[PDB]
Design a protein around this ligand. Structure first.
Ligand SMILES: CN1CCN(Cc2ccc(NCc3ccc(C(F)(F)F)cc3)cc2)CC1
Ligand SMILES: CN1CCN(Cc2ccc(NCc3ccc(C(F)(F)F)cc3)cc2)CC1
Ligand SMILES: CN1CCN(Cc2ccc(NCc3ccc(C(F)(F)F)cc3)cc2)CC1
Ligand SMILES: CCCCCCCCCCCCCC(=O)O
Ligand SMILES: CCCCCCCCCCCCCC(=O)O
Ligand SMILES: CCCCCCCCCCCCCC(=O)O
Lengths: 278, 59, 238, 250, 278, 59, 60, 238, 278, 59
């Protein structure tokens, strides 16, 4: 045998007739912290309905199984400022609001990651644009914490012998790659109500547990007679996801990339009066 | 070493696909988005003593 | 080698694709798994939990917490309206930011029945009866208790049990409804009226409050994942 | 009758004649760490009846204008009985808790309180982009008060009640384990919280496992009575506590 | 077994000889609404003919199983007008006449969809054309109803976390993708004889049931020193089709994209007289 | 998990092809344009009482 | 990897082709089917229905 | 030919990929293998070998070899400290360049227990006792022997056996620790104190020395291969 | 059967209680050259711990199984100097410090090799840059020892009949290739403490055993009106590795590509005193 | 001629992949990084006479 052969619809509605008895499903007590389990069949007459709807699209795997941008930055092929010819980004998921809010609906997460890179280039404006340049090439370097960090585009650190790297040429498909679960703990933590030092001092919040490393990007050897600007976008796509301890979605707009600071916001919008329905 | 499993379709209207793994790391596999098990009891009925819907909540 | 031909769509990046890719940390040993309490495997489980509904949006709430309380009085004109609202869980301001509306706002279609639970938070010696009715879609919302009582409704009697539930059945011409509801997919109205009135003995407050809880039944479902419009940014966070 | 409950831990007992059911965390009862999940190697200490017993924190007053209070654990119990000493003398700790809140009033009073345990209740500062010390959010057993208006002092946390100091809708806290104290039919709330964290064990002085919040959703009210306030008392009892890593105290 | 092994010719003609009887197949009555089922064998002598013709190409699946353009629009990489640098199209099948008429031969349809995108670029004329630009990249965004809509090319909404999107680079094969049956009802409706409000007021016709969403397109980061114009064409190809209640093909020319309005037209062309055959 | 079926050809003049599904959604499959069933009765004979071609339409 | 060679016709878009493509709404639940009266499976069925012929085209 | 579609990542060069490629010397005959003594199949085997630890980094060592010797004297004030150090095998200067720290510097995560072996290199007639203690992470390192003895420790008696071992158990809140250790992943301290003092007979030197050896236990492990920062160049070698 | 169906966690910790006996695992004697095999269970009370950690990532195969750059050089398509239009590199692994140190941790190695080439081109600056050039092509030539060596770009030696070569066009994936174990001895030698002549004279050190050949690169026929510069990077990735006789890692910085020469270096950094721990 | 073997995964949380060789030279095969055997005795216990940890090292 060279093959191995490896769906749950929502509940149906049962027919109910007139009733007159001492049983009172309608009345309950919310003080117990218990959500009532009543159904429409328990408070009115209903017909028999066979329901084929399924909750497949509501699973956490599908909810978080979408690629979302997490960072973009620009770097020039040639310029006077050395720091402006390459990028250096500390990895974190708090930079972009949509994905930040999507992830922040759970306290702990455990998943594999799929990373895709989209790179585009454009020629900067100027008084003289006539030139001929072959196709450009780009290098993406990942430096785990504690490793050497390059200080310039042509630094020796770009000779990766252990640090994984990807070389990509313009005109082909976007680069893609997979990352396993690389947390020292048993699960990622979106929130951390604690301090760094044992005497309750120092850094506070989720900034203390962010030690994922850095990412560096540069033009391999391209150096045009005239400046050329390139942009890189990073996309994250969790796989094989598991979540714990859901929490209410955020209401106030984000204001800091490494803090929960916010400004007070109204609960919701208003209307003319309690009876207005138009 | 090929897996054969059914694919999502309608309710009452060859619904098979084949998958093979090419890499030695399980992290390289495709998303396993075919699981549909769920249990809301942990959040809807966290009480110690079981309560029957028909009987009164208290006394 | 083996002859082959590329079909349309090659070299494209689709954000919702499922393909295998190489691992850049081969033979990496992951941390052993641990069974943390409170695992969630489906957002519907979250959606089925009750949450307080801010019904008192009177445009003059100097105190935000006042939005959660529905006022009630002792000598009420007979058969008066307590409150009224539109049944648009994903669009109406009342249900917009609730624990349920937040989940629906990530989707485009929804279906199933809903639960509304009301709890009386008055004195222990106070008593009264209330009529809560659900009116399916129509050309005009009800204006009086006689109009309201024609639709689905329940008579609530306040006693030892301080809470009552009002299952809003799923009555619609289509299997699904749009979250961004319109005239075509309207859902109806919900209103509450005095049935007998509130009576209190001497030495008690002359006013009371009621609270409402919203949750989904076991036949609820959603579809078409979309991006929520409640959150936005103008510049990169730093 | 199911309206009477009795709890016995160690050499202390709690009796309530007027109570609702008991909520058990996420359906998980507290338990000791298993052999196949542990990471530390040296034998753990299991102070049994000496640390697992009810400890009553100080009492608060409930007035007509109260807005709410919160406590952070285990910093609240950091200096209580042998539990505090064992916390001080050890590097790693682990324990579940049982929370009991008492509030009683006559049949002519009205009000509703929300009792909820929020794990990892990270809070933001009043002045965005300005740090706060570890004194505006935990100073032992004392309770911290929410504020109706927006906080303005830069040295303390944003106490906006309707946001709960976490940037989320106060009405959505129902997702966490919780109970309601309604003066009509209830006088106490009981919650059993298991140990929830991303690691098998953690230092209790550096990390706040969870936060306890009490919010009056319906303000207290009464008329023509000699009682001017309704005291609230909180009692907590660690369960299945075990510590590891003996070092010099502090 | 790792394999699973999974044609209807038209009717033949039977030999018929001389006949003289009371049976009269020729005479019938159209007043019954019944189409006569007579055959040439019933009115004249015929030989035996074995017929191998088949109606395979006349099936609805094959008739509608052809990709057809449904929309084209132009957008510039750089320009003063913000609205002119991206496209925003509400999805509908009434824009182009050929496909509109092909679909409008049936009242209700139910099918899967296959969408293909063809994108081409050209450099706008000007007094100075000398420039060098790398290959361009394009993004296609689909926004279900009620989702946020971008207001400019560099808006935050382009960071899709849940909205599906496709990134495509010029020089490769056209982008392709599949869509399932996404109607709230049990089948698509080409016609709707009704109103929007319950009191017979408001919008009228098939415009009321069009809530399929929007599609947005932009240049990812391309911004040339000189303007460049790009055009996108959208092609729809129904799959797994089912149809109900056929209706006569349209005769008058279309005049509105969201209405049945028309101008009266003659039934057909004329000839000299009823006997002219030349 | 491979299907083998015949391919269109002439009348009387290895006429097999293999198909495999790679995706988990049935909407991704290729068109099933190999069905040739048809029944014109619904539109040609919508009458209640059956009429015989040989006998007179009326009386 | 596996050696391969592209043949003529690769990367072309033929409007009458039959190929599989990825689905952009994975695990989407379609509405249950209903048997509406009057299903048509072949245009010939339409073609076999009678229709009035405008023979009197007398130009006047 | 066979229809196909290219997925994202095609034509990319990943430095940690595993793919087959053509051979440019077909049917090449390799030299027969020979079993040279001393085969190594895992860097952990190297990591488990002892190495001398330069504890005496007193900022005034005119002689480099002095770094390896811990001074000791005859009439020591009672309960004096011999040495103290931080337990950061991959970051502290003491363990940075040891045979173990060098291996750890090629990785990012580490876990397991460690062994510290001390050998007395004094006269045969000398005698004494020493207390060696390991203090888990805390707000303050020990300052006195009374503070030190509260943690894990061993009493070392000098006799015919000239060496004693001090297994540093793996006590941590996480399964792994960062090589670039920080406050969050601190590991503690190790200190040595006089237990009884050193006594010598007439006609012997008044001073002695001790040496320390560091190695990993059989439960040690590493993870996340990274590039070491100890070696760098500015121009191509010639 | 057309298929053939083809993990070792670290040691666990056993529970230990109080002990009082004559056995003394703690005391040993390092003078024997023996490393103690004690465990924490032998000196303190311990709980039972099941450990799932594995040493998979620490194997030599994975440690050395990463591609690392070993050489880069530049050559121009057109120039006055003949020697500047092509590259000639004697193969050796001592040029780049990271890979040199990684390899030098073992005395003898035996492995297959995987070679990847990354080539990029750029247009040199000048007063006139306007030109049009088709895509360039490059040739890589490998010359085993003793073979003919080209003296110019258009030499006859570039007509390889036995020497393997690779022709590569810009815009495609980087070239890749495999090399078997090609040492005359039974294993590669990183160090050689000996001389070349039998009378202990001549060359000394590992330079004597380096006879791997040369590599040559050129533009096939590209000759632009204006100069164009190209750079090539060579990456080595050992496969199927075996190692013997480990040696301590180097401490002093490298200074010569074919010698062990060095400058004395301090053992390690200093601190205030022997008791400083802050 | 296809090999089926397990792929790296967790401790207690279809974990199979297929491999085929296309070239006639063994040097073209992929890295065999699935071997995890090790023995530190050669470097940790190079003594001639076996020493027991419990007994004294000397005498
Ligand atoms: C705050 N969030 C905590 C969880 N964490 C999950 C996470 C972990 C690792 C990554 N790695 C992305 C990556 C970087 C670099 C490469 C390289 F190109 F170097 F190979 C590959 C993948 C992402 C997310 C997210 C933050
Ligand atoms: C009036 N006609 C009613 C039937 N309707 C059928 C139909 C339904 C959905 C689509 N979707 C096309 C599509 C848009 C966007 C994407 C995206 F790129 F966003 F993924 C993919 C597919 C088409 C036709 C047609 C109108
Ligand atoms: C000092 N180090 C000794 C071991 N030696 C290993 C080794 C042996 C051979 C190669 N060949 C690389 C190579 C060159 C040229 C081609 C050609 F393009 F010509 F086909 C292919 C492969 C590499 C390393 C390294 C030095
Ligand atoms: C690296 C794996 C390449 C696999 C190539 C496609 C499959 C070829 C073998 C045919 C399928 C049989 C697989 C099996 O035996 O399970
Ligand atoms: C994602 C599926 C990839 C399939 C690759 C081609 C088929 C390889 C296996 C050989 C065919 C056998 C399939 C089957 O068992 O039904
Ligand atoms: C040069 C080898 C090309 C192999 C092409 C893919 C495999 C096709 C045959 C299916 C797998 C069976 C292999 C076997 O019999 O072991």
């Amino acid at each position: 045998g060279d093959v191995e052969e490896a769906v749950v619809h929502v509940a149906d509605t049962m027919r109910s007739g007139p009733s007159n008895s001492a049983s009172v499903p309608a009345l309950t007590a919310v003080e117990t912290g218990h959500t009532s389990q009543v159904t429409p069949s328990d408070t009115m007459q209903t017909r028999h309905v066979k329901n084929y709807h399924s909750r497949s699209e509501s699973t956490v795997e599908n909810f978080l199984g979408r690629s979302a941008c997490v960072y973009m930055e620009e770097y020039k092929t040639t310029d006077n400022d050395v720091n402006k010819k390459f990028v250096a980004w500390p990895i974190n998921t708090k930079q972009m609001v949509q994905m930040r809010r999507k992830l922040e609906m759970f306290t702990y997460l455990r998943f594999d990651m799929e990373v895709t890179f989209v790179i585009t280039s454009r020629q900067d404006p100027g008084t003289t644009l006539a030139q001929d340049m072959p196709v450009l090439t780009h290098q993406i370097m990942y430096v785990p914490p504690g490793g050497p960090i390059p200080a310039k585009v042509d630094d020796y650190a770009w000779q990766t012998s252990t640090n994984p790297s990807i070389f990509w040429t313009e005109g082909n498909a976007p680069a893609r790659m997979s990352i396993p679960f690389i947390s020292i703990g048993n699960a990622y933590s979106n929130f951390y109500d604690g301090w760094s030092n044992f005497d309750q001092r120092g850094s506070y919040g989720y900034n203390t547990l962010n030690n994922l490393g850095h990412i560096y990007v540069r033009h391999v050897s391209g150096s045009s007679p005239h400046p050329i600007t390139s942009t890189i976008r990073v996309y994250f796509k969790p796989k094989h996801t598991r979540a714990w301890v859901p929490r209410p979605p955020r209401l106030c707009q984000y204001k800091k990339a490494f803090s929960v600071d916010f400004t007070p916001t109204p609960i919701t919008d208003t209307r003319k009066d309690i009876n207005t329905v138009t | 070493g090929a897996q054969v499993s059914t694919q999502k379709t309608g309710a009452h209207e060859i619904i098979h696909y084949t998958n093979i793994n090419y890499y030695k790391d399980a992290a390289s596999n495709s998303a396993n988005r075919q699981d549909f098990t769920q249990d809301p009891s942990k959040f809807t009925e966290p009480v110690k003593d079981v309560m029957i819907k028909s009987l009164p909540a208290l006394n | 080698g083996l002859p082959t031909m590329n079909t349309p769509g090659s070299t494209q990046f689709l954000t919702s694709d499922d393909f295998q890719s190489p691992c850049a940390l081969p033979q990496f040993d992951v941390t052993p798994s641990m069974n943390i309490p409170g695992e969630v495997k489906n957002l519907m489980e979250i959606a089925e939990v009750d949450s307080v509904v801010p019904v008192n949006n009177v445009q003059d709430t100097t105190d935000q917490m006042e939005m959660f309380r529905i006022p009630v009085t002792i000598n009420a004109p007979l058969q008066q309206q307590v409150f009224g609202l539109r049944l648009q869980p994903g669009l109406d301001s009342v249900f917009k930011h609730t624990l349920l509306g937040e989940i629906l706002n990530y989707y485009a279609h929804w279906s199933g029945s809903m639960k509304l639970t009301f709890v009386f938070c008055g004195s222990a010696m106070a008593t009264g009866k209330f009529l809560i009715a659900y009116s399916p879609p129509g050309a005009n919302p009800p204006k009086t208790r006689k109009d309201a009582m024609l639709g689905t409704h329940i008579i609530w009697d306040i006693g030892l049990q301080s809470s009552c539930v009002l299952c809003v059945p799923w009555i619609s011409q289509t299997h699904y409804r749009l979250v961004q509801q319109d005239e075509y997919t309207s859902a109806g109205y919900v209103t509450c009226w005095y049935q007998t009135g509130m009576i209190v003995p001497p030495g008690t407050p002359n006013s009371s409050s009621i609270m409402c809880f919203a949750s989904a039944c076991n036949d609820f479902s959603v579809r078409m994942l979309r991006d929520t419009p409640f959150i936005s940014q103008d510049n990169k966070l730093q | 009758s199911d309206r009477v409950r009795s709890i016995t831990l160690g050499n202390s007992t709690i009796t309530t004649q007027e109570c609702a059911n008991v909520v058990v965390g996420y359906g998980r009862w507290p338990t000791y760490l298993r052999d196949d999940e542990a990471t530390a190697e040296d034998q753990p200490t299991q102070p049994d009846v000496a640390t697992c017993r009810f400890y009553t924190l100080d009492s608060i007053k409930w007035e007509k204008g109260s807005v709410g209070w919160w406590w952070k654990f285990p910093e609240a119990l950091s200096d209580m009985g042998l539990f505090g000493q064992n916390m001080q003398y050890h590097y790693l700790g682990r324990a579940g808790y049982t929370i009991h809140v008492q509030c009683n009033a006559s049949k002519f009073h009205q009000g509703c309180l929300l009792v909820v345990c929020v794990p990892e209740a990270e809070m933001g500062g009043a002045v965005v982009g300005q740090a706060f010390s570890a004194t505006a959010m935990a100073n032992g057993d004392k309770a911290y008060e929410f504020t109706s208006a927006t906080q303005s002092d830069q040295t303390k946390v944003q106490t906006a009640i309707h946001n709960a100091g976490m940037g989320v809708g106060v009405g959505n806290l129902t997702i966490y384990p919780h109970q309601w104290i309604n003066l009509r039919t209830n006088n106490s709330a009981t919650i059993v919280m298991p140990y929830i964290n991303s690691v098998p064990m953690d230092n209790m002085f550096r990390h706040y496992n969870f936060t306890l919040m009490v919010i009056p959703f319906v303000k207290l009210d009464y008329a023509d009575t000699a009682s001017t306030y309704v005291p609230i008392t909180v009692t907590v009892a660690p369960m299945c506590a075990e510590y590891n890593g003996l070092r010099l105290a502090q």
